[PDB]
Every structure is written in C-alpha cells, then in structure tokens.
Write a protein that binds this DNA or RNA. Structure first.
Lengths: 97, 72, 60, 214, 77, 102, 88, 82, 106
RNA sequence: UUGUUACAAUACACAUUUUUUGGCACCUGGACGGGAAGAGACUUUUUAUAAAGUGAGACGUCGCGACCCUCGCACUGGAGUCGUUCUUGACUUUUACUUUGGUCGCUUGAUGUUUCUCUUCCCGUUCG
C-alpha cells in the first residue's frame, strides 16, 4: 500500500506511540525489563534493540525458572551475558520500578 | 477452495477439539469460513446426546479439520 | 552482571552492598592483573599488595 | 595389506533386495581384493568404513577371522564367504546383525563354532554350505543347540520340532577349478583335457583357466 | 450464496443473541450479542456471559468484551 | 561418516539422503528431490521411523541400542509446517545400473 | 544360447514366503558374484526369479556352481536368460 | 514451486494423507489446490484410535495435512526436469 | 525488518540455540536465512537432564534427539553430535551469543 | 572468440485464518535376558471344602505352519517421430492393471497401541 520510506517512518511512529514504547523507554533509559516467556521462564535483562515482531537483543541476562523433585519444588537461576530472543515466545514484559 | 461442487448438499465437518457438526452448506470464502444451515452438533447417539445449534451458524476456517459430503 | 541490582535515577553506579562491592573489587583486581600478567609476562599469584597498588593506580 | 585407503574408495550403492521395490539398503563392496587379517592395521582401517552400511560384501578374500565390527549397529547383512575363516567368534559380529554368510570357508570342528553362543540374539539367518564341519556327524542338530532362536541354516528353514528339540540337551583357489570339473559334461571333460594336452602358450593357459573357472 | 462475513453482518444488524465456541478451550462457551465485526473476524460482544460445559445456570457475566478472532471456532444463533 | 561443505544450503542438497525431524517425534528418511519457499519437502524412496513408547524409557539416563518402528512411504510430500530440523545421512551414490559391466 | 549377465532361476519352492526367497537368493548367489538385482513377479511368473550380476565371469560361474543345488528343500535350476533385465 | 506442482500432477491417482490429529485417509485425488487443500474420493479412513472406516468423499483443509504419499511413478514425471 | 539482518552478521560464531522443545544446540553458525532458518556445523545437541527426567513432557524431544542418528554412547545427559543441522526458523526460542561480542557494531 | 533475443535468478518485501513470529504447558552380592518351579491373586461347576485353566479387560501389523489356484524367459507392453542396420539408442501418445490369492491353527513367534488396581533353581552378559 504505502511507499517504502513512508513505511520506515511509520515503523518509527509505531515504536514511539504504540504499545511497544514501554520496551523503547527501557531501551533508551538502560533499565532492566522483566519478560515472562511462554515456557514459564522469566528473563530479567537490559534491552539493546527490538523489532516489529517483538524479537529483542538482550544483554546482562538473568533467567529464573522452576524445577520439581516429587514433593519438593526448587529455583534455578542461570546467568547469560548476550542473548537474542525470538519474539513469539513472549507473554508479557514488565518495566521494574 | 473448490466447495462450489457441494452447494447446499449435507456436510459433516470435523472441527478443532474432537468436535463434529453437520449441516447444509450455504456459503464459503477464501479462508474456508463456512456458513451452514440446520446445524446439529454431532456429539454422539442422536436421540439424547446431540444438539441443534440454531438457524444460522458460521465456522472459522482455521478450525475446520476436514469435511465429508455425506450427501453423495 | 545482576539486573536485580538497579542504578538509581540520581546515581551513576549500581546499588551494590558492601559484600557485593568486595566481590566486585576482587573480580576487577583479577581482570586488571590478568591483562597485566599477559602484557608484562609476570606471575600474578606472586605479587605483593603494594605492587598491586602501584599497578592499579598506574604508577610508571 | 588392510590399508585405510582401500576402505574409503570401496564401491557402494543402494540395493532393493531386502524390500523388493525401494532402494533403501546400502551395500559396501570389498570383494575380490585379497585383504587379510592384521592385528594392528585392520581395526584402524574399518573405522573409515562409511556410515550407514547395511550389507558388507567381504566375499572372496583371505581373512582368517571375523573382522572386529562389534560396536557397529547399522550392518544387518555380513557376507564372509570364500575366506580362510577358522572360528566364528560371535562377540565380534555387529550388534544388530541379522544375516550371516560363511560359505566355503575353513571351519572343521565343533569347537570352532563354539563361540557362536556370544552372537546377537537377533541373528536369524546363517549359511555354512561348502565348509567341512558341514559334513561332520549330525552337524545341524549341534549348531541349532548353539543358537536355538535362529530361523535358517544352509537355506533349510528351521522347523518347529527342530528348535523344540534344541532344549532337550540340558535334560586353495583350485577349489573352484575342482568345483567346475565336478559339475561338467564328461565329453567336455574329455575335450578340455585334450585342450590342456594341446596347450601351446602362456596366454592360452590363461584362456584355458577362464574355461576351467567359468 | 451467502458469503460468511455477510452472515456475520446479518447477526450484527439484527442484534440477535449468539453463542460463540472457542478454539482449544472446550470447557467454556461465550454467549452474548455481536456489536462489532471485523476484517480479521475479531468481535465485540455485549451483555456477555461465559457458560461452562452445560447451561446458563452455571455461567458468569463478563460485561462488554472484545473477543479476539484467533479464538473463534463457531458463531451460532 | 558424511561431511558436507560448510557453505552448503538446502538448495545444494538435492539427491542427498536427508533425515527430517518433525514436531511429533518421528523422522522421515529419503532422497531430497525438491523443495519450496515454505520448506515443503519432497522425499523419494522414503522411510518413516519412530521411537515407540515401549522402549522410549531406555533413553532415560543411566551397549545402548533401540529398536525403532519403521514404515515405508513412496514419494512423500512433507508439509513444511511440521518440520523441526533436517540432518544429512549420506551423499548421492551411484546407481547400480552404472556398476553393470558389459 | 548365449551367455550373458542375467541368470534365470526356475524351480523355486512355492510355500516359502517370497520376501525371504529374495533375501536368500541374494545370499546364495552372493558368493559367486556381485548381485545387482533379484527380480521376482509371481503373478506374472510364478516360482521363478531373474538375477543379474556385475560381470559375465560371475554369471557363468554361478550358472555352473548352483544348477541343481538344494535350496529350501527343493533342487534349484539355474540357466542363462534369453535377455537382459531392463528395470535393474 | 515443485512440492505443489507435484500434487497437481497427482490428479486421478490414489494418494494417502496423514493429518496432524493422527487420522489417515487413502483415496483417489479428485482436485487439489495450491494451499494443499485436497479432495479424496472412495476413501479408506483411519482414526487416531486405530479404528478404520470407509467414506464416499472428503475435503481436507491444507493446514492439517502432515504429509501426502504419492504413486512412485511420478519420480519420472516431466515436472522434475531442468 | 531489522534483527534477522543482525543474526546474518554472526556467521562462523559459536552460538548456542535453544529450541522450543527445550533442546539446546551448540554450534558454528554457517548461515541464517531471511525466514531465520539457521544452519549450524560441528553441532552438539543436548537435552538438559533436570528436564529430560519427565518422559510425558519430553518424549517428543528425546525421540527426535535420538532419531537424528547422532546420539552418543550415553556418556552423559543425552548428547548428540552432527556435522550439519538445518533448523527451521520458528523452532528457535533463544540464541545465546558469544560472551565477547561487541553488539553495538551490528 | 563475441553479441542480440526469450525464460528462470537474486537483493527487496513478508506478526491478524492455509506453512516461518507458537494452544503451549502440566501431566560374596547388585543389574539385564532364556527355561523350569512355588506362594499369592483371577475365571468356571458347587456351598456356609472337592475339580479344570491363567496383575486383568480391548484393538491393529509383520511373521510361522497346514490346505486349495500352478507348469513357466519375466520387468510397462502396443502405435508413431528420427541416427545406425536384419531391430538397437533418444522423444510424444492410448490402454488397465503392474503387488499369486481364498480359508484355518497362533492354548500366542514376535510387535505396536487403549481401560482399571513376591520369591527359588540353573544358564548366559557385566560391575568390584
């Protein structure tokens, strides 16, 4: 429909006015989001980029997840430094206070 | 979507879940959304277990598994 | 290295505790002295704290 | 002789024999090459054998033992006929072997076959025709005692009563030249004899050795 | 020949109640009146109730909802 | 075991024998004849193989071998949506019709 | 009759399963040549097979060696085919 | 491309379908569409439970088809030529 | 638009790709297509053992790991190794990237 | 050796129903296998012990064995367009099928799927 340059500027408009602007505020402020993923893992990380599909390059990652051993249930706590994340697996992103 | 060959002739549709419905095919589109008439939920043994849906029924095409024209 | 340790809006460095600072400063010592040991070809495990002090401050 | 180079150039293709229509089983051909058992060289050569391999055609060589292919699991058929094999050590057959051929080898006493006890339980087909233990007394009834669950020996279907009875016990190139002469028209025998008397050149000996071996 | 979206519209303008069957979530159905329809078969439903699976006695009221079209299997009278 | 050029994509692997994983834990093994934008995949001389549940538990962590079920299929088209991964089993071998010597 | 690549096998046991006839005709003939194909169509040609070898010097040897051999309880017959196999 | 021009060459031949739900349908291919929708006639059908039935005609939505088995004769159809 | 063309500038790096089965693929990244189909070489495919223990959730993952043709002699924790895997892009959950990489240049 | 014309590249684009921007997640001793035995439990006749069989109910697929069709040169075979020669190579188009099949015995030869709730003897492969 629209021209390529207009679509480029439209993407910029959407990133600033749309729902994605929560991620953009955290990316520009360099403050960590929390990301509940589809597999009940929660990432904690600083965003460095994102796109239309909600893919996002993350840095400084911590990744909480939970494991069970019969009657017991326990926390794992992996650390990662640099991580691309495919967007489709994202339930809900927070911005921490 | 070559459904034109069926027209109103009675169809049973397998649907997402286990679910089945059968009815008189009134119309269709490129998604295979299907609108069909006198639709019964084919739940099981007819005299107690089936249900009659309503005078108009439309099915979202992503939920059609397959459809068998039981009229010829 | 741990996003649960935030940087306040009015600050420049993350909000480590004293214990976390001790850990961080030890790791920083290891980093600086690893690069120094590679560059100058010296055994880091043999250095005195006074030599380490001169290396950290960049004397000569 | 058993180099790491000749196993890698070993001709190979897909064959339909095990399924009729679709070429889904792969043969490696190491036949007619006179390989022989070296205790150092050979196990460092057969680790360059291609994967998967389904049929391994080691026929008409000078092997003296089952080549240790114990840990491989692709090979279902293992052709070792016309080799100088002495004993069948079953632990060195492949894990999932099904189908073994030992025709016209040098096996001559029941203590040679005695290690077939360690062959895989999924071995179903065996062939020992043309050996000399083949001719010893009641040999079939013995080798069934070693591998009762087997399905065939010497292309004889192991029938029910045979394997039922198996549980009762607790309670050199000139071979082929003779083989042709054994199976020849007497007048053609009395014609190639004359030709050998008539023989007049080394290349004519070579032609006469074509006739004497097909 | 009745195109399917035109039948959806013929539910909308006539303000008839409908029952809507969800995609994988067999244990509840949505009942209400179609207020809005869409290119992508999203719908807006007013005086909505979600009825478990069997009848209106056990349902619970939602108010006005937008039900995203990715979750619709059947729309029925 | 087979090695393929590091610069090689699925358009080069025509006639190679692939083993193609799918979202349901089955594997299809066959000669790649053709493919499409979607990763729709046409396999000649094809075999389906699966790990039956009777001995799936033999893969639980502890001379390890597994008797797969196998099923034979002619000239399958796989719908790309189902495919999980692709692995290469071996290269384009010669036909047996080439080995015949006059 | 002319010696060629393809053997005709002509007196096979009926009651044995065909599938293991094809397998065991591979195994029998293997020690006298590189067997390429073992054609068997029992509706069109009952109790027979056609076998094709890599070389003539294996076809002749197997034609001599195996003719009359007992194979699943019946004496086999083997001769040259009047053709060569097309499908192969 | 070719994985659909093949299924259009499969017309008038028996094909066997498996579906994501685990069902299986073997029958004559009447018509096929670029979306991989297919129409099968004189169909032998199988449930995920392994129960078997026969049914006169069926239309299957492409998004459900897991794979389609085609007669082996098509490997030499003109379609694959350069 | 953007970030697949970021992955395309990681050719010949030692990535770790985590698939939606929970199966983890260590690998030399030979290519990423515009659809995100990754090609890896010198590959090592792992189900983590805390996860692998429950068969009902992981049977699809184990069965497809074994059936690659590359599962090792059970030295530990259901590894495989392959010279070459072509991954359909939608299957990828995360890509853990090399620790020293200067992301800002890309 | 070079140029012109015809058809496919590719970069690009590509989150809202048919593929690639997710209905998915949750749920001295130990071990392995073959053959004899035993307790316990289950089915049936019968009653407030006497007798014959085998954790239980259910559905598919290879395979084994026995009885009826079976007497042999096959697989694309016809027709047409051409090089070369007593019919061998490349190409286009009709025809109905290219799998010997029907029955029985499996008190199971193995194998894959659904519903409900223990020891002895030897034999073979490993561990220290």
């Amino acid at each position: 429909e629209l021209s390529r340059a207009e679509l480029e500027e439209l993407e910029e408009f959407e990133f600033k006015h749309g729902p994605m602007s929560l991620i953009n505020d955290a990316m520009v402020t360099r403050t960590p989001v929390i990301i509940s993923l589809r597999n009940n893992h929660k990432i904690i990380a600083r965003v460095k980029a994102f796109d239309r599909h909600c893919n996002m390059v993350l840095e400084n990652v911590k990744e909480l997840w939970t494991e069970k051993k019969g009657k017991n249930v326990i926390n794992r706590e992996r650390f990662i430094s640099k991580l691309f994340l495919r967007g489709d697996s994202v339930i809900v992103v927070l911005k921490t206070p | 979507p070559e459904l034109k060959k069926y027209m109103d002739k009675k169809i049973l549709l397998n649907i997402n879940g286990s679910r089945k419905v059968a009815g008189i095919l009134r119309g269709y589109d490129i998604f295979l959304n299907v609108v069909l008439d006198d639709a019964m939920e084919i739940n099981g043994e007819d005299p107690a277990n089936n249900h009659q849906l309503g005078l108009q029924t439309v099915i979202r095409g992503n939920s059609i598994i397959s459809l068998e024209a039981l009229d010829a | 290295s741990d996003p649960t340790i935030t940087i306040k809006s009015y600050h420049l460095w993350p909000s480590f505790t004293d214990e976390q600072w001790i850990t961080i400063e030890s790791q920083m010592r290891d980093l600086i002295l690893t690069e120094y040991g590679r560059k100058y070809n010296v055994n880091i495990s043999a250095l005195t704290q006074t030599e380490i002090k001169d290396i950290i401050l960049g004397q000569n | 002789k058993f180099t790491p180079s000749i196993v890698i150039d070993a001709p190979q293709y897909y064959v339909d024999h095990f399924n009729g229509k679709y070429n889904v089983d792969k043969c490696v051909i190491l036949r007619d090459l006179q390989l022989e058992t070296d205790s150092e060289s050979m196990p460092s050569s057969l680790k360059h054998l291609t994967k998967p391999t389904h049929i391994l055609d080691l026929t008409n060589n000078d092997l003296i033992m089952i080549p240790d292919l114990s840990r491989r699991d692709d090979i279902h058929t293992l052709l070792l006929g016309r080799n100088n094999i002495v004993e069948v050590d079953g632990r060195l057959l492949p894990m999932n072997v099904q189908n073994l051929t030992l025709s016209n080898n040098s096996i001559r006493r029941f203590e040679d076959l005695q290690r077939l006890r360690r062959a895989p339980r999924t071995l179903k087909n065996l062939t020992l025709i043309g050996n000399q233990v083949c001719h010893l007394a009641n040999y079939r009834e013995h080798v069934l005692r070693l591998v009762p669950h087997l399905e065939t020996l010497d292309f004889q279907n192991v029938t029910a009563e045979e394997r039922k009875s198996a549980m009762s016990f607790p309670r050199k190139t000139m071979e082929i030249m003779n083989l042709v002469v054994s199976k020849m028209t007497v007048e053609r025998r009395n014609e190639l004899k004359k030709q050998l008397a008539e023989a007049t050149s080394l290349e004519e000996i070579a032609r006469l050795e074509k006739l004497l071996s097909g | 020949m009745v195109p399917p979206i035109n039948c959806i519209f013929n539910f909308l303008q006539q303000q008839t109640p409908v029952t809507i069957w969800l995609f994988e979530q067999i244990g509840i159905r949505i009942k209400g009146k179609i207020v809005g329809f869409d290119e992508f078969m999203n719908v807006v439903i007013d005086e909505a109730v979600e009825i478990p699976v069997e009848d209106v006695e056990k349902g619970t009221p939602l108010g006005k909802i937008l039900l995203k079209g990715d979750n619709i299997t059947l729309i029925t009278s | 075991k087979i090695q393929v050029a590091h610069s090689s994509r699925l358009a080069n692997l025509i006639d190679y024998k692939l083993r193609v994983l799918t979202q349901d834990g089955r594997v299809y093994i066959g000669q790649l004849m053709a493919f499409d934008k979607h990763m729709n995949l046409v396999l000649n001389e094809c075999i389906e193989e699966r790990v039956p549940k009777t001995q799936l538990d033999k893969l639980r962590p502890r001379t390890l071998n597994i008797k797969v079920e196998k099923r034979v299929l002619g000239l399958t088209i796989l719908r790309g949506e189902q495919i999980l991964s692709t692995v290469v089993e071996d290269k384009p071998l010669l036909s047996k019709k080439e080995r015949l010597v006059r | 009759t002319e010696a060629k690549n393809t053997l005709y096998v002509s007196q096979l046991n009926e009651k044995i399963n065909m599938q293991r006839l094809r397998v065991n005709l591979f195994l029998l003939f293997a020690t006298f040549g590189e067997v390429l194909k073992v054609s068997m169509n029992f509706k069109k040609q009952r109790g027979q097979a056609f076998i094709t070898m890599r070389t003539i010097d294996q076809a002749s040897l197997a034609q001599i060696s195996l003719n009359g051999e007992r194979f699943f309880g019946k004496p086999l017959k083997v001769e040259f085919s009047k053709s060569e196999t097309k499908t192969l | 491309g070719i994985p659909v021009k093949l299924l259009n060459e499969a017309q008038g031949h028996i094909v066997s379908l498996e579906l994501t739900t685990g069902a299986t349908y073997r029958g004559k291919l009447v018509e096929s569409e670029d979306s991989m929708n297919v129409q099968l006639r004189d169909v032998i059908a199988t449930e995920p439970q392994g129960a078997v039935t026969h049914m006169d005609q069926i239309f299957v939505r492409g998004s459900q088809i897991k794979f389609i088995v085609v007669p082996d004769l098509l490997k030499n159809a003109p379609l694959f030529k350069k | 638009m953007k970030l697949v063309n970021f992955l395309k500038k990681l050719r010949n790096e030692q990535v770790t790709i985590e698939l939606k089965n929970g199966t983890t693929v260590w690998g030399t990244l030979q290519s990423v297509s515009p659809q995100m189909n990754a090609i890896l070489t010198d590959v090592k495919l792992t189900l983590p053992q805390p996860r692998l223990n429950k068969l009902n959730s992981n049977g699809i993952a184990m069965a497809s790991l074994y059936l690659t043709g590359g599962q090792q002699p059970t030295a530990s924790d259901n590894i495989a190794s392959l010279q070459y895997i072509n991954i359909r892009g939608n299957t990828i959950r995360q890509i853990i990237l090399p620790d020293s990489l200067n992301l800002d240049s890309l």
